[PDB]
């Protein structure tokens, strides 16, 4: 039933990302599913613009991370578990 799940991940703060990814692995492990992740890509630079009060005549880029995982086979409990966990805030985990 739509077994080829596709998951990517944006990661503004690595600390939350390692734990989050580890939880996404533990939910598949506990249901019985096994899969390969996170496969981290190098740090991506996202230029930042800021607008502080006018300085006399202000960050402009902060580090980001990215990960990707699939699923070999979602058990009926694995979809309710994947939807059941609460994604850590501040990180965009939009499913591919």
């Amino acid at each position: 039933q739509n077994q080829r799940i596709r998951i990517r991940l944006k990661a503004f703060d690595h600390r939350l990302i390692d734990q989050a990814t580890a939880e996404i692995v533990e939910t598949a492990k506990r249901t019985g599913a096994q899969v390969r992740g996170p496969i981290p890509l190098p740090t991506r630079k996202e230029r930042f613009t800021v607008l502080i009060s006018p300085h006399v005549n202000d960050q402009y880029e902060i580090r980001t991370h990215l990960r990707l995982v699939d699923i070999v086979e979602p058990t009926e409990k694995t979809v309710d578990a994947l939807m059941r966990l609460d994604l850590a805030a501040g990180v965009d985990v939009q499913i591919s």
Binding site: E23, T27, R30, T31, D80, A81, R84, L85, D86
Partner: protein
């Protein structure tokens, strides 16, 4: 420089009355909370993990099932009250 608080503007307007009352009294007071008001109970929730919770969700299926069983069997004692006609 909005300072858009009507009551504050009134405070500046009625500042002289405030001065008339300023002498020999408590100026402002602020009490909050209570023991019964401030129980928070936040000692330990890590044993419940988001994996454990997502893996063991709140299930009350057996309760509703059992309930339907009871109601059916009670209708069956009303069948004991029932006569064939």
């Amino acid at each position: 420089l909005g300072s858009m608080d009507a009551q504050t503007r009134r405070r500046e307007r009625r500042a002289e009355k405030q001065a008339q009352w300023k002498a020999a009294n408590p100026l402002l007071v602020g009490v909050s909370a209570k023991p019964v008001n401030r129980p928070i109970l936040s000692l330990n929730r890590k044993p419940k993990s988001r994996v454990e919770s997502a893996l063991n969700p709140i299930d009350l299926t057996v309760l509703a099932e059992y309930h339907k069983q009871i109601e059916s069997n009670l209708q069956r004692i009303e069948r004991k009250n029932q006569r064939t006609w």
